[PDB]
């Protein structure tokens, strides 16, 4: 017999191998469509979550009840010091998918970047990238990187730029940088390459990638919550106070005919630590780190022109539960996925 009294399902399936994520720096899954006409830019970056705050903006939505009123918007602040480009990488299109030719990273490399290779390192001899580098100065420094780029010019189509974060600058206890390919959505390969050629080894800050008031999408991993019963996980009903064996459950899993519990019935399971792509968040402010020309500029952070104090976004006693944001943040409308200190793509 039918359900007497209809209702929506509890919690979407288009979402549902609700497992502990296999990765942790939010992997970008789709890089925007490179229209070959507009200039070369990077399409992504890699900040990290600090904390949050009361922003007060004047509004300009003619028609609304709040035209020209003050409102407070809750905002995150994403600590985003500049990212170093180490290596470039070329993808060719195929019937079978999108295979990768030729990864080439720089002479030099870094040391934080090294970290994101050999698991336990104080044990290691730190040998990574020691015979690669040797190529950035000889006769075979002209073969396998020159004939190579010529190759990546010829046959290749889509070019990303491997870039490692500067972990050192942060208050995190972490020293292990966050490498990621960031696609270049430029105009034409070669132009989209004699450029990455040039930005090897080189600082890349947030004001290249991003503009203040661009809608962006944040890609990161949900804040962890352990095993949860069905009522916390799938957010179901509770059964009444009477029930002999547990009231934080689902009564009926299935009909004693499709003789399997289904796909799509509510269950106990890992909640949180899930990968998630949140979209279309606004940038309220692109920041600037407190740098020196004489004696600090803490001012150049939270000092809007309509108040002109000398604040840093750092509240009194840090962003509780990591620390002080000492370089370029981006201030994002509302809340973003993930806990504090979290790598946020």
């Amino acid at each position: 017999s039918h359900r007497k009294f209809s209702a929506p399902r509890h919690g979407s399936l288009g979402f549902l191998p609700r497992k502990r994520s296999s990765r942790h720096r939010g992997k970008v899954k789709s890089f925007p469509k490179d229209d070959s006409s507009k200039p070369v830019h990077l399409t992504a970056f890699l900040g990290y979550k600090a904390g949050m705050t009361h922003i007060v903006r004047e509004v300009d939505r003619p028609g609304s009840k709040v035209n020209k009123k003050e409102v407070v918007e809750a905002v995150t602040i994403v600590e985003t010091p500049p990212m170093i480009v180490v290596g470039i990488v070329g993808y060719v299109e195929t019937p079978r998918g999108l295979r990768t030719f030729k990864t080439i990273f720089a002479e030099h490399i870094s040391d934080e970047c090294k970290r994101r290779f050999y698991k336990n390192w104080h044990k290691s001899k730190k040998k990574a990238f020691t015979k690669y580098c040797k190529k950035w100065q000889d006769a075979a420094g002209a073969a396998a990187l020159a004939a190579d780029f010529s190759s990546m010019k010829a046959y290749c189509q889509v070019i990303r730029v491997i870039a490692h974060t500067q972990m050192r600058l942060l208050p995190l206890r972490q020293k292990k940088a966050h490498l990621m390919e960031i696609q270049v959505n430029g105009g034409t390969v070669a132009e989209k390459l004699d450029w990455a050629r040039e930005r090897l080894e080189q600082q890349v800050p947030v004001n290249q990638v991003f503009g203040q008031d661009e809608m962006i999408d944040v890609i990161g991993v949900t804040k962890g919550k352990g095993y949860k019963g069905v009522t916390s996980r799938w957010h179901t009903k509770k059964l009444p106070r009477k029930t002999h064996r547990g009231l934080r459950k689902v009564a009926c899993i299935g009909a004693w005919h499709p003789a399997r519990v289904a796909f799509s019935v509510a269950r106990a399971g890992q909640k949180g630590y899930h990968h998630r792509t949140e979209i279309n968040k606004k940038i309220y402010k692109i920041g600037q780190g407190y740098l020196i020309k004489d004696g600090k500029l803490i001012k150049n952070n939270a000092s809007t022109d309509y108040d002109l104090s000398d604040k840093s976004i750092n509240p009194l006693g840090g962003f509780v539960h990591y620390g002080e944001v000492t370089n370029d943040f981006v201030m994002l409308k509302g809340c973003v996925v993930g806990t504090k200190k979290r790598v946020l793509t």
Binding site: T94, P95, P258, R260, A262, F263
Partner: protein, 201 residues
């Protein structure tokens, strides 16, 4: 015959071909069907789309990741149809399928090999000219390929290339024929003995 087979899927009939492939796979002969986008089907476009979409609804309710795999690439689609004509539960049937091999477009090694055509699965022969149809390419697209565009642009790139070879090969034959005439009185009593027992007339 012996050795590896290469069949050029274009202009064939999806299952009519696959029955012939599958017979020879079971006789130990290695077949390689190529260019499966080109493979075509009797009945009008939509008919077989509608018939495919019927497939896609067939799906193991209690978990679908177990349930039937409705592969979308024509290679894969055809494989399926060949496979249904093998006894693939058993060891000889899986050992059979391994002798098969199937591509969308026409790849390395197989660009570079001459390649054959089953007239008894060939559309112009098997069908009437006043009847309608799908290309498994377009069918495959509207069902969830991602790679009709790519395997187009690559095949156009291959065609342009292959044309060069065809033209250079064309130019060697013109040399052969001119060099027969430029030496036809010290091979004029060998060519004799050719044309006498049939060869070369």
């Amino acid at each position: 015959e012996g050795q590896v087979l290469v069949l050029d899927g274009r202009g064939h009939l999806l299952g009519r071909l696959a029955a012939i492939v599958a017979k020879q796979v079971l006789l130990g002969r290695k077949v390689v069907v190529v260019r499966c986008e080109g493979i075509n089907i009797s009945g009008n476009f939509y008919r077989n789309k509608l018939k495919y979409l019927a497939f896609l609804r067939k799906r193991m309710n209690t978990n679908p990741s177990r349930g039937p795999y409705h592969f979308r690439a024509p290679s894969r689609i055809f494989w399926r149809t060949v496979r249904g004509m093998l006894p693939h539960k058993t060891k000889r049937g899986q050992a059979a399928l391994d002798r098969l091999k199937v591509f969308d477009g026409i790849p390395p090694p197989y660009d570079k090999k001459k390649r054959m055509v089953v007239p008894a699965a060939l559309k112009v022969v098997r069908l009437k000219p006043t009847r309608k149809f799908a290309y498994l390419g377009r069918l495959a697209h509207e069902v969830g390929w991602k790679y009709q565009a790519v395997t187009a642009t690559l095949e156009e790139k291959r065609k342009e290339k292959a044309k060069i070879h065809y033209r250079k090969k064309k130019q060697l034959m013109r040399l052969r024929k001119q060099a027969e005439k430029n030496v036809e009185k010290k091979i004029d009593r060998f060519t004799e003995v050719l044309k006498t027992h049939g060869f070369l007339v």
